Every structure is written in C-alpha cells, then in structure tokens.
Amino acid sequence: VFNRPILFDIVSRGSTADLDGLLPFLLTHKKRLTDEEFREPSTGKTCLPKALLNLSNGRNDTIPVLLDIAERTGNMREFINSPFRDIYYRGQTALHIAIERRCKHYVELLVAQGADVHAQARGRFFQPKDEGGYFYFGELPLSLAACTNQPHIVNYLTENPHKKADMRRQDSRGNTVLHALVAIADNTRENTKFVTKMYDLLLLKCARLFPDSNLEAVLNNDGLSPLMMAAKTGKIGIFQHIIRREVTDEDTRHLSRKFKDWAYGPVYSSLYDLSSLDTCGEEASVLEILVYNSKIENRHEMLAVEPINELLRDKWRKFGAVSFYINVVSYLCAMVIFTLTAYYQPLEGTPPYPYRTTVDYLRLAGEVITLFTGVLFFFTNIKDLFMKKCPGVNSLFIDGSFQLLYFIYSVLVIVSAALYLAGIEAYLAVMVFALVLGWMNALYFTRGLKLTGTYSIMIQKILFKDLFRFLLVYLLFMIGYASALVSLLNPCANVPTYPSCRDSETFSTFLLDLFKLTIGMGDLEMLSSTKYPVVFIILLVTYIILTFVLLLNMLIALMGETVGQVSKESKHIWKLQWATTILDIERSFPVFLRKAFRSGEMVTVGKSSDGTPDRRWCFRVDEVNWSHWNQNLGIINEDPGKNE
Ligand SMILES: CCCCCC/C=C/CCCCCCCC(=O)O[C@H](COC(=O)CCCCCCCCCCC/C=C/CCCCCCCC)COP(=O)(O)OCC[N+](C)(C)C
Ligand SMILES: CCCCCC/C=C/CCCCCCCC(=O)O[C@H](COC(=O)CCCCCCCCCCC/C=C\CCCCCCCC)COP(=O)(O)OCC[N+](C)(C)C
Ligand SMILES: CCCCCC/C=C\CCCCCCCC(=O)O[C@H](COC(=O)CCCCCCCCCCC/C=C/CCCCCCCC)COP(=O)(O)OCC[N+](C)(C)C
Ligand SMILES: CCCCCC/C=C\CCCCCCCC(=O)O[C@H](COC(=O)CCCCCCCCCCC/C=C\CCCCCCCC)COP(=O)(O)OCC[N+](C)(C)C
Ligand SMILES: CCCCCC/C=C\CCCCCCCC(=O)O[C@H](COC(=O)CCCCCCCCCCC/C=C\CCCCCCCC)COP(=O)(O)OCC[N+](C)(C)C
Ligand SMILES: CCCCCC/C=C\CCCCCCCC(=O)O[C@H](COC(=O)CCCCCCCCCCC/C=C\CCCCCCCC)COP(=O)(O)OCC[N+](C)(C)C
Ligand SMILES: CCCCCC/C=C\CCCCCCCC(=O)O[C@H](COC(=O)CCCCCCCCCCC/C=C\CCCCCCCC)COP(=O)(O)OCC[N+](C)(C)C
Ligand code: NA
C-alpha cells in the first residue's frame, strides 16, 4: 500500500490526509522508515528531506506526523540523522535542509528531539568554488545559518534548551564559523554587511560563553586564522573590520584591535594591535600573506588601510630605505665591474686566458666577482622556485618579470664562463647580452621612489598593451612590401654591384632600409635599377604614410590612452613593489635583528579578567576630529600625551 514511489508523491504533495494508515501498515509488517527499500537508491533521500524540499509557503504539515510514526516503530536519532550517502550531498541531513529553506519553526522541532547540530556536509556540492562545488558555508548547521544571514537560529543553536552547537567545532578543514564567513564573503555592499554582523555576534558570544582563548585564534588545517584567511582570499570588508575592531563593554574589550590611548580635546591617539601583522620571525603574519601569496586584484586596497601603510613607512625609514640603497650601489658597481672587463677583454686567438700582468689580474677580479653575481642570482632564483615564485610570470609587475630576467643574466654569465673556459670564442656574444640585461635590470632598483618605480612599470605596460601590437602589424606591412619591392628588382645574373641589383642578401638589407624609413633615420634612396620604377615609389610612399604618419604616430597616441589609464594602477603596483622590497629585506635579517627594528611597543591595554595585564605590541596613530567630541570610551592613559 505504501511503497517507495507512492509516498514520495504524498509528502511532496503535502497532503496529511491519505498517509493516515502508515502506522497500522508500518507496524504489523515490521518495516522502518529508514530502510533501503524505502529510500531513493542514488542519494539516500527520506520522507523528512523530501517534505522540506517540497515546502508549501513555509509550512509542510507532514513532518510532525512522520516523526510520530517514526517513534511508534521507534527511531529519531536514526531517522532525522540519516545522511545522503552520495559523493555529492555527503553528510547532508534534514537540519541542513531546514535552515537553507529558512524555516525556523522546524529547526526547533528537529533539535527538540536532539537530532544533530554538528553533522558535516562534506559533499562535492558542499565544497568551495575552487574544487568543483558551489557553496561552502563551512560544513555545520551553525556555520550555515551564519553564512546565510539568518541570525535567530544562530542564537537558537547556541542558546536553546536542548543540545547546543558550540562555535569551536571545526569542519573537515579546520574552518570554524568565522573561517567560513570569510569564505562566503565577497567585497560587495550587502555581503560585507551581514558578514561583519554575524562575525561580531559570535566572537562576542564566544566570550560570554567559554571565557578562554578567543575563537578568532583557532587556526585551521592549513595553519591560518580568519584574519590571515581574509588576506589570502582578498576579503577587504571583513579584513578592515577586524583590524579596526573597537569593543567598548569592558567584559569584551580584550576582543579589540583599535584602542584609544588618550584623547585631549579634539586630538586623540589610536593604538593598533600588531599581534599577527608584524611578528618578527616566529609566527605566520598577515603582512607577509598580503604581500606575497594573495590576490593581486585587492592587495593595494588591503595595504591601504589602518596601520599597514604607516607600518611599512615605519620599516622603510629604519632599514628598508638604507639597505635598499646599499643594494643599488652594490649592483651598479657590479655592472661597472662587469663593464670594465668586457672593454678590457682581449680579442685575439683562443679565448684570451693569458693574463700575465697586473691589469689583467685586475680584470680577473672583475670576472670572478662577476661569476659570483651570476651563480648568486642563480641560486637565489632556484630556491625561490622551491619557495616564493610562480605567479603569472612576466605579466606580473611585482618582480614577476625581473625574477625571469635575473635568471637569464644568471645563465649567460655561466654559459659565457663555460665557453671562455671550454675554449669556444663566443663567450663574448653571450656576455654582451648579459651586460645589457643587467643595466636594464637596474630598473629593478627604481622602487625607492614613486617617480621612477611608476616609470619602470609603465615601460612594461606600454610594452604589452602597446608596442607588441605594433610589432605584429608592422611585420605584416613590412614583409608585404619587402617581398613586393624586391620582387621588382632584377637579379645579378641579369652584374657584380648589389646596391643597384638583387642577389642573395637583398631581402635582408632591404628590411633594415625599411625599418629605418618608418622611424625616420633612413633615406628613400630611390632606385632606377628596378624594371618598373614608378610603381616602386607608389609603394614606398604608402609604407611611409601607413607606418610613420599613421602607425608610429598612432603608436604615440595609444600610449597617451595607456598612461592615463594605467597611472592609477601604476601607483598601486608600486606600493606592492615597494612593500615586497621591505619584507624581503626584513625577511633576510635574523630574528634578533628584526626584533630590534620592531615597529611598535608594549602597552598595558587592559586586564584579562584574571588580573593579568594584556601586554600587546601596538602602533600609535595620532588623529584629529572636531565633531566626535564624546571620546570618553577607552582612555587607557588618563594622562594625555606620551609624557616622554
Ligand atoms: C626570443 C626568441 C624565442 C624563440 C627562439 C628563437 C631563436 C632565435 C635565435 C636565432 C639564432 C640563429 C639561428 C639561425 C642563424 C644561424 O646562426 O645560422 C647558422 C647556424 O647557427 C648556429 O650554428 C647557431 C648559432 C646561434 C646559437 C645560439 C642561439 C640561441 C637563441 C636562444 C633564444 C633567444 C632568447 C633567449 C631567452 C629565452 C627566454 C625569454 C623569455 C621567454 C618568456 C618566458 C650560422 O651560425 P654560426 O654559429 O655562425 O654557424 C657557422 C656556420 N658556418 C658558416 C661555419 C657554415
Ligand atoms: C633602531 C632604529 C634605527 C632607526 C634609525 C635609522 C637606522 C638605520 C640603520 C640601518 C641598518 C641596516 C643597514 C646595514 C646593512 C644591511 O642591513 O645590509 C643588508 C644585509 O646586511 C646584513 O645581512 C648584514 C648584517 C648586519 C646588518 C645591520 C647592521 C646595522 C646595526 C646597527 C643599527 C642599530 C640597530 C641594532 C644594532 C644592535 C644593537 C641593538 C639595538 C638596540 C640598542 C642596544 C642588505 O640587504 P640584502 O640582504 O642584500 O637584501 C635582501 C635581498 N633580497 C631578499 C631582497 C633578495
Ligand atoms: C633563457 C636564457 C638562456 C639563453 C639561451 C642561449 C644560450 C646560449 C647560446 C650560445 C651558444 C651559441 C654559440 C656557439 C657557437 C659559436 O661559436 O657561434 C659563433 C657565433 O655565435 C654567436 O654569436 C652566438 C650568440 C649567442 C646569443 C644567444 C642569445 C642569448 C640570450 C638572448 C636573450 C636575452 C637578450 C638580451 C638582449 C636585450 C634586449 C631584450 C631584453 C628584454 C626586454 C627588455 C660563431 O662565430 P665564431 O667566432 O666562429 O665562434 C667561435 C667558434 N670557434 C671558432 C671557436 C669554434
Ligand atoms: C649606516 C649603514 C652602515 C652600513 C654601511 C655599508 C656596509 C656594507 C656594504 C657592503 C657592500 C656589499 C653588499 C652586497 C649586497 C647585495 O647582495 O646586493 C645585491 C646586489 O648584487 C650585488 O651586490 C652583487 C654581488 C656582489 C657584490 C657587489 C659588487 C662587488 C662589491 C662592490 C662594493 C663596493 C660598493 C660601493 C663603492 C662605491 C661607493 C659610492 C657611494 C655613492 C653614494 C651616493 C642585492 O640584490 P637583491 O636585493 O638580491 O636584488 C636582486 C634582484 N632579485 C634577485 C631580488 C630579483
Ligand atoms: C637607478 C636607481 C634608482 C635611483 C633613484 C634615485 C634618483 C634620484 C634622486 C632624486 C631624489 C628626489 C626625488 C623626489 C621628487 C619629488 O618628490 O617630486 C618631484 C620633483 O622632482 C625633482 O625635483 C627631481 C630632482 C630634480 C633635480 C635633478 C637632479 C637631482 C639628483 C641629484 C643630482 C644629479 C645630477 C648630476 C650628478 C652630478 C654628480 C657628478 C657627476 C658629473 C660628471 C663628473 C615632482 O613632484 P611631485 O609631482 O609631487 O612628485 C610625485 C611623487 N611624490 C611627491 C609623491 C613623492
Ligand atoms: C603560422 C605561420 C608559419 C609559417 C612559417 C613559414 C616560414 C618560413 C619557411 C619558408 C622559408 C624557407 C627558406 C627560403 C629559401 C631560401 O633558402 O632562400 C634564401 C633567401 O632567404 C630566404 O628566402 C629567407 C627569408 C624569407 C623569404 C620569404 C619568406 C618570408 C617568411 C616570413 C614568415 C612570416 C611569419 C609570420 C607572419 C608575421 C606575423 C606573426 C604571425 C601571426 C601571429 C603570431 C636563398 O635565396 P637565394 O638562393 O639567393 O634566392 C635568389 C633567387 N633568384 C635571384 C635566383 C631569383
Ligand atoms: C591606396 C594606395 C595605393 C594606390 C595605388 C593605385 C594607383 C596607382 C598605381 C598605378 C600606377 C601606374 C603607373 C604607370 C605604369 C608604370 O610604372 O610605368 C612606367 C613609367 O610610368 C610612367 O611614366 C607613369 C607616369 C607617372 C604617373 C604615375 C601614376 C600617378 C602618380 C600619382 C599617384 C597618386 C595615387 C596614389 C599614391 C599615394 C598613396 C597614398 C594614399 C594612402 C595610402 C593608404 C614604365 O616605364 P616606361 O614607360 O618604360 O618609362 C617611361 C618612358 N620612357 C621615356 C622610358 C620611354
Ligand atoms: Na599625445
């Protein structure tokens, strides 16, 4: 009377008037609502999911009934819990369905019987949009309700009579509720609204509940926290909100990262928490994540917030400026040292090994210092291949290209030294390409000034969305005419004189004469040796119009369309270049020296409810406001000033 297909029409239909009869039929035959001849063969779906999917205006009258019949045969902690055993909805239960349908009345019901509030929806659907899934809320019903802008259940699953969902529970990746809100978040307006609210709501609620380590400290199975997870994923709206977290109620002020050290009239000093941002060596940091392994589309907005920008300038003036300007002079000299050898490198015989003088020993000092630079830039770039390297190289204006070019320069100094030692005499030609790269690799060191650093990246953008497009067509106009005009010149079999005639290098030299014409440093050198002389000049004049008057001047005009558009991008890319420069210098120091150039200070920011004073390494920011007069919230230092 009640087989599989007939019921799943009923509970789908929502008619609680023909299923009066399951009990006398589901008791004498000794069946159960959780059998294999009663669930769909593919997923594992049951009456109780099917009801909530087929929900009539927020009300399916069958769920109060089926669980009554479930009890009188007997199952609640096996019926409600029954997960879909698919590889695609794995772990999903009726409760995961009761909240996504946004039905609160039954979440009370499903929890009233004590179903589960930590079942983990591990399916390929319940997977981020980086694996082959759609919607990753975490994996828990609590993490779901928070990640769907549904506060009242997020309260309920915490504050209810029956079994409570704690916030400390990790999903299969370590990610708690707050790790998950950073995952579902985007940097839109309405998303960042409830993300921050439900973010706030919980770590406040974690403190009134378990009075211990904040939930925001709970790392995951990658090693990251919600703040370091926002930095890696590019979530500004929450990333901002964490760093400027002012909590006023003194029971939870310890969940703050912006403080108010003092406020005399309309001037106050704000004091930021650099607990994770600037950790000198020991811990993983927010600042090394934004700058190295993050999303380049939003780093400039994540580095252009509270203390980060002030924090990098506070590193540049200490050590970042100086050490950089020792890196530049040491490189320029190394290229002087590499210049002098090539100018005093002899050019007779086998590769000129014999030195036998003082000057030739001074040259040898230049070749040994040189080969060091090559192998140095070799090893430093190969260890980078095992460590930081491999973004979208050479379309990446944050040392993506220069890493590639110093690697080339590293090869050619090793090749040239191989051939200079293997006896081949073309050490020079390879060495000559190395020399020119290296002086062009001194554009690397234009980061110490917004002027020249903004300059060396426009060069690289006007070399992409600009003069390669030109090289394309210009090679079509040029091969077209170069083949067309040499087709008119008569061979030298006809007889010895090239510049009138055609033989065997005509094309080659003639391209150069056409390359000179477009740019202007050539002469037409009009020729009567051709068989049709008038048609020849019809074609040169079209080359000169369609290449100097039309393209090479349009080439100037496209740059103007570029440098007006990529200027704002270029100021933002420099701030990454500049920052990546600092953290590389800093990272190269030992920990005791980083810990000597700390950007901050210990401050007694409050008591940790045990009398333990909270000694956080922090960063001051003087600020002024002639409108926010009631600055009487968190005045740590009642005596305003720093009183040095
Ligand atoms: C940029 C190019 C990319 C595609 C590859 C195109 C290659 C172009 C080079 C053309 C070489 C010349 C070959 C034809 C002419 C020639 O030489 O003909 C002959 C025979 O040739 C040779 O014996 C070989 C000599 C050259 C070898 C080294 C080239 C190395 C080029 C490397 C590529 C350049 C970029 C490298 C950087 C890569 C990374 C960048 C980032 C990429 C983005 C990530 C004459 O020679 P000769 O020695 O005089 O022989 C004597 C013959 N006799 C007279 C005695 C009978
Ligand atoms: C204190 C605030 C000062 C503010 C005022 C301004 C001061 C500026 C001083 C600048 C110092 C840095 C410049 C020196 C050269 C330098 O650092 O060259 C670096 C590397 O050099 C070293 O490895 C040498 C080891 C020793 C260095 C420090 C010596 C200075 C110490 C004295 C300063 C004062 C503090 C401590 C002294 C100890 C006692 C405790 C203090 C507290 C009181 C007792 C060059 O970079 P490179 O690796 O080539 O680039 C990275 C390459 N990559 C990763 C990008 C590929
Ligand atoms: C990925 C990097 C690795 C590169 C791969 C290529 C490496 C090695 C090739 C060298 C071996 C070939 C020569 C051996 C045979 C020989 O000996 O051949 C010679 C002539 O050979 C040459 O001239 C070889 C020219 C080499 C240059 C290649 C390109 C180098 C790299 C190019 C890329 C970098 C660009 C920079 C430019 C800046 C602009 C853009 C910047 C970027 C944009 C801003 C024959 O004459 P002969 O006197 O008889 O020789 C002596 C022979 N004897 C009599 C002793 C037996
Ligand atoms: C108050 C501060 C007290 C400290 C004072 C200074 C102390 C020590 C100075 C030590 C000098 C050597 C430091 C080397 C640092 C270094 O390794 O630099 C490298 C640069 O390559 C080299 O150096 C090549 C290696 C061979 C050495 C140089 C040539 C031989 C020695 C010359 C020394 C003489 C100097 C100058 C004489 C002329 C003077 C005119 C003044 C004028 C003042 C205006 C940093 O490249 P990287 O960051 O890794 O970026 C590369 C790109 N990539 C890989 C990251 C993408
Ligand atoms: C390759 C490595 C990289 C090197 C980098 C350092 C290079 C240069 C140092 C420049 C420092 C100042 C730059 C700040 C400019 C600025 O801030 O503002 C600029 C104003 O520009 C200037 O005034 C440029 C200088 C004018 C005089 C030229 C020579 C000065 C250098 C020293 C002398 C060199 C000569 C002769 C040598 C003779 C010696 C005997 C040998 C002779 C033979 C024996 C525009 O204002 P704004 O629009 O507001 O800027 C926007 C950026 N903003 C404000 C946000 C930072
Ligand atoms: C996907 C396309 C792939 C196609 C590639 C095919 C290229 C070449 C293979 C064929 C050449 C074989 C060698 C020729 C024979 C030879 O050895 O001839 C030599 C002379 O030297 C040449 O002729 C070689 C220079 C070029 C010649 C024209 C071809 C032009 C090729 C241009 C390729 C264009 C690519 C791309 C377009 C640009 C835009 C970017 C793309 C799209 C986006 C990426 C011997 O002369 P001699 O005996 O003295 O003759 C005298 C005869 N007399 C006096 C008796 C009548
Ligand atoms: C859209 C661009 C392409 C247009 C192409 C179509 C136009 C013309 C091509 C056909 C020309 C044919 C010429 C005649 C054939 C020839 O060559 O006959 C030669 C001699 O010729 C002549 O005496 C012709 C007199 C001069 C007038 C030339 C044409 C008119 C010139 C103005 C052209 C204006 C338009 C265009 C140019 C500006 C372009 C920039 C725009 C933008 C581009 C996108 C044969 O020698 P022979 O009689 O044996 O020697 C003389 C007799 N004696 C004394 C030895 C016995
Ligand atoms: Na213009």
Swiss-Prot record:
Keywords: ANK repeat, ATP-binding, Calcium, Calcium channel, Calcium transport, Calmodulin-binding, Cell junction, Cell membrane, Cell projection, Charcot-Marie-Tooth disease, Cilium, Disease variant, Dwarfism, Endoplasmic reticulum, Ion channel, Ion transport, Lipid-binding, Membrane, Metal-binding, Neurodegeneration, Neuropathy, Nucleotide-binding, Phosphoprotein, Repeat, Transmembrane, Transmembrane helix, Transport
Catalytic activity: Ca(2+)(in) = Ca(2+)(out)
Membrane topology listed for this record: Multi-pass membrane protein
Keyword Hydrolase: no
Resulting phenotype, residue 84 to C: Decreased ATP-binding
Positions bound to Ca(2+): 523
Gene Ontology BP terms: actin cytoskeleton organization; actin filament organization; blood vessel endothelial cell delamination; calcium ion import; calcium ion import across plasma membrane; calcium ion import into cytosol; calcium ion transmembrane transport; calcium ion transport
Activity regulation, short description: Channel activation is inhibited by binding to phosphatidylinositol-4,5-bisphosphate, and to a much lesser degree by phosphatidylinositol-3,4,5-trisphosphate. Not inhibited by phosphatidylinositol-3,4-bisphosphate and phosphatidylinositol-3,5-bisphosphate.
Tissue expression profile of the protein: Found in the synoviocytes from patients with (RA) and without (CTR) rheumatoid arthritis (at protein level).
Residues annotated as binding a 1,2-diacyl-sn-glycero-3-phospho-(1D-myo-inositol-4,5-bisphosphate): 102-104, 149-152, 197
ANK repeat windows: 90-119, 137-166, 222-251
Role noted for this protein: Non-selective calcium permeant cation channel involved in osmotic sensitivity and mechanosensitivity. Activation by exposure to hypotonicity within the physiological range exhibits an outward rectification. Also activated by heat, low pH, citrate and phorbol esters. Increase of intracellular Ca(2+) potentiates currents. Channel activity seems to be regulated by a calmodulin-dependent mechanism with a negative feedback mechanism. Promotes cell-cell junction formation in skin keratinocytes and plays an important role in the formation and/or maintenance of functional intercellular barriers. (Microbial infection) Facilitates hepatitis C virus (HCV) replication, possibly through its action on DDX3X.
Residues of the full protein shown: 148 to 803 of 871
Cellular component terms (Gene Ontology): adherens junction; apical plasma membrane; cell surface; cilium; cortical actin cytoskeleton; cytoplasmic microtubule; endoplasmic reticulum; filopodium
Consequence the record notes for mutating residue 473 to I: In BCYM3; results in a gain of function and a constitutive activation of the channel
Family: Belongs to the transient receptor (TC 1.A.4) family. TrpV subfamily. TRPV4 sub-subfamily.
Effect of residue 169 to C: In CMT2C and SPSMA; decreased protein stability; decreased ATP-binding
Entry-annotated residues carrying Phosphotyrosine: 106
Parts of the chain on the Cytoplasmic side: 1-322, 388-400, 447-461
Residues that coordinate or bind ATP: 45, 50, 54, 89-92, 101
Name recorded for this polypeptide: Transient receptor potential cation channel subfamily V member 4
Subcellular location: Cell membrane; Apical cell membrane; Cell junction, Adherens junction; Cell projection, Cilium
Medical condition linked: Brachyolmia 3: A form of brachyolmia, a clinically and genetically heterogeneous skeletal dysplasia primarily affecting the spine and characterized by a short trunk, short stature, and platyspondyly. BCYM3 is an autosomal dominant form with severe scoliosis with or without kyphosis, and flattened irregular cervical vertebrae.
Description of its domains: The ANK repeat region mediates interaction with Ca(2+)-calmodulin and ATP binding. The ANK repeat region mediates interaction with phosphatidylinositol-4,5-bisphosphate and related phosphatidylinositides.
